[PDB]
A paper describes a structure:
Most importantly, the T6SS from the Gram-negative, pathogenic bacterium [name] was shown to inject at least three different effector molecules (named [name], Tse2, and Tse3; Type-6-Secretion-Exported) into the periplasmic space of competing cells. [name] was shown to be an amidase that cleaves the γ-D-glutamyl-l-meso-diaminopimelic acid amide bond of crosslinked PG, and Tse3 is a muramidase that cleaves the PG-backbone between the N-acetylmuramic acid and the N-acetylglucosamine moieties. As injection of effector proteins by the T6SS would also cause cell death of siblings, [name] co-synthesizes the cognate immunity proteins [name] and Tsi3 (Type-6-Secretion-Immunity) and shuttles them into their periplasmic space to confer resistance. [name] adopts the fold of N1pC/P60 papain-like cysteine peptidases, which are widespread among bacteria and of which homologues were identified in eukaryotes, phages, viruses, and archaea.
Author numbering:
A (entry chain B): 23 to 169
B (entry chain A): 3 to 149
The structure:
């Protein structure tokens, strides 16, 4: 079960955007020279701190990370991430301890929303929100959670 | 500047809707169709994937995105484009500072979300991901637009 993580500036580390809960801290760096308040992170790495063991890893390669497309699992074992390229999109789930990819799924052309309930995927929309879609499909986040 | 006729064509084609229902800003192929129709520049038909196929046949292609900015600053319509597995992407290239000293500024709508969109504030390297951005093809129209 994933809960949304807000990604905000980290005072003390110039150009660092991140957030955390009891279990996991996620961090990007902003290499965009023009915007001091980005919405996306094209350039890796992504830093994941496993706050239980106190170790860290790095996601070294990856599609453009959506700020506020970041979700942490209840057990703290998984991190869910929205990653796009051009007009493609996908939801990737990573192992918070090893940074390994655990599940990938194409989401291209769909509008989307996740919460504790699951994943909602809509076609034929008329706005940014998935509730604007004439077709809405529920998909299980269990293969992302692996609990 | 000289490339103004194109930036104007972009700014106006943004809130338009080439495809009856879906707004241009949520459809990269629809936005390019609106810009080119304003400028009177013949465009291949179909989705982004079909358009790129179409450009590769008739339109001459440039060696680099740096060279794309050169043609763009000269008032030439320049389309950056990469074929997808199902959803390809296409963008208008405009003059201005190159991101990472390599990738040209752009205007494009995107079904991915606001993240994938650019109103001249993101380069093709901030729209396409790390892997993709180096596989882009840059196509230019034979004749000038603002001469």
């Amino acid at each position: 079960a994933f809960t949304q993580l807000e990604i905000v500036p980290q005072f003390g580390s110039p150009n660092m955007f991140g957030g955390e809960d009891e279990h996991v801290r996620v961090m990007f760096s902003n290499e965009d020279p023009n915007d001091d308040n980005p919405d996306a992170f094209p350039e890796p790495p992504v830093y994941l701190a496993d706050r239980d063991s106190g170790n860290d890893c790095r996601i070294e390669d990856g599609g453009i990370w959506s700020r506020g497309g970041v979700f942490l699992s209840q057990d703290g074992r998984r991190v869910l991430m929205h990653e796009f390229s051009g007009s493609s999109a996908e939801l990737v789930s990573y192992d918070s301890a090893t940074c390994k990819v655990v599940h990938r799924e194409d989401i291209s052309g769909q509008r989307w929303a996740v919460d504790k309930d699951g994943l909602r995927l809509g076609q034929k929309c008329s706005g940014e929100s998935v509730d604007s879609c004439a077709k809405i499909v529920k998909r299980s986040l269990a293969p992302f959670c692996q609990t | 500047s000289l490339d103004q006729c194109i930036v104007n064509a972009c700014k106006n084609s943004w809130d338009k809707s080439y495809l009856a229902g879906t707004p241009n800003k949520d459809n990269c192929s629809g936005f390019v169709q609106s810009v080119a129709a304003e400028l009177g520049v013949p465009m291949p038909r179909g989705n982004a994937n079909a358009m790129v196929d179409g450009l590769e046949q008739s339109w001459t292609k440039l060696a680099s995105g740096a060279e794309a900015a050169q043609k763009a600053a000269q008032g030439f319509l320049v389309i950056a484009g990469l074929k997808g597995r199902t959803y390809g992407h296409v963008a208008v290239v405009i003059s201005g500072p190159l991101y990472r000293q390599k990738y040209p500024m752009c205007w494009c709508g995107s079904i991915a979300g606001a993240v994938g969109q650019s109103q001249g504030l993101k380069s093709v390297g901030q729209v396409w991901n790390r892997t993709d951005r180096d596989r882009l093809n840059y196509y230019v129209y034979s004749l000038a637009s603002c001469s």
